[PDB]
Amino acid sequence: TVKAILILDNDGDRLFAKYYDDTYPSVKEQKAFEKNIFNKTHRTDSEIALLEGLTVVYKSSIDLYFYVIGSSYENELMLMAVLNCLFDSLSQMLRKNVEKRALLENMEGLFLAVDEIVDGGVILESDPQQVVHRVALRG
Numbered sequence: 001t002v003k004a005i006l007i008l009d010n011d012g013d014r015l016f017a018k019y020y021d022d023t024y025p026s027v028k029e030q031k032a033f034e035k036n037i038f039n040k041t042h043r044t045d046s047e048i049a050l051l052e053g054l055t056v057v058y059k060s061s062i063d064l065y066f067y068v069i070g071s072s073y074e075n076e077l078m079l080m081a082v083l084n085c086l087f088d089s090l091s092q093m094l095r096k097n098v099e100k101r102a103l104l105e106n107m108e109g110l111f112l113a114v115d116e117i118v119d120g121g122v123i124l125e126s127d128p129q130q131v132v133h134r135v136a137l138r139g
Contacts, residue, residue: 001121002082003054004069005114009100012038015064016110020121023054037067046083048076057083061098081126082117089113089128093135112138 003023007016014034024030033052040051043060050056050072057079058067068083070076087098093109094102103110112135116125125131 001074002068002070002079002118002123003121004067005082005086005118006034006037006065006067006069007103007110008034008038008065008067010063010065012065015100015103016107016114018114018118020118038065041065041067046080048080055079059083059087061087063100064098064103078123082123085117085126085128085131086113089117089131089135092128092132108139109135 003021004017004019006014009015012035017030017034019030024033037051037056041058046059048055048057053072055070055072055074055076056067057076058065066083066087068079068086070079090098090103090110090113093106093113113131116131116134118124
């Protein structure tokens with residue numbers, strides 16, 4: 001189970017957020033959480049942390065920070081598989097430039113990919129090759 005997927009820009013500003021349960025019901029609480037996460041994280045190719053009582057697996061590209069968040073009890077490799085599948089699906093779709101400019105140019109790609117990976121918090125698919133194939137079929 002995934003509780004959230006976030007992509008923040010280099011200023012910590014939300015490019016994409018999806019929350020799958022009621023942990024952060026208001027937008028003010030979500031944005032505060034996003035700010036806290038951002039301020040407690042840094043550039044990396046892949047890190048796991050407990051933050052805010054939750055398991056956060058995350059990674060950065062040149063100007064984007066990608067987080068996949070689960071409960072404090074979750075299998076953290078499952079959460080990493082989501083994060084890799086999302087990132088690697090984008091890498092294929094963005095011709096290997098995973099950056100704010102390219103991603104904003106194909107946000108539907110992004111939205112459809114996340115919907116192939118997670119459905120209401122349930123992890124449906126961790127192979128990015130599968131995901132990109134299905135996004136191509138849907139838009």
